């Protein structure tokens, strides 16, 4: 595929907190740090 522009967001979170990064998923990070919109298209990469 060919995209218009790509934005990469990088940060570090706890081991079990990785589930919180998801459209329409709530939590401490989701509510106060980083929330994905429900109409989110893109990949999320997590490695220890």
């Amino acid at each position: 595929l060919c995209f218009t522009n790509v934005y990469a967001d990088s940060f570090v979170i706890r081991g079990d907190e990785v589930r919180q990064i998801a459209p329409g998923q709530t939590g401490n990070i989701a509510d106060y740090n980083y929330k994905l919109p429900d109409d989110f298209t893109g990949c999320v990469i997590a490695w220890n």
């Binding site: 459209p23 329409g24 998923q25 429900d38």
Partner: protein, 49 residues
């Protein structure tokens, strides 16, 4: 009528389910109700004739 979904109430789908497949449930309910209304309109057309 549930039409295969888990609930007949839209707000129940909203509260008890997260959006990504709540959309699927809403789509199922919407298409079922649209089919019902289509059937009603078709029978009304025949009876009107």
């Amino acid at each position: 009528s549930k039409f295969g979904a888990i609930s007949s109430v839209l707000n129940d789908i909203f509260s008890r389910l997260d959006p990504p497949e709540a959309e699927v449930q809403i789509d199922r309910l919407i298409t079922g109700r649209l089919q019902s209304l289509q059937t009603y309109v078709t029978q009304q057309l025949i009876r009107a004739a």
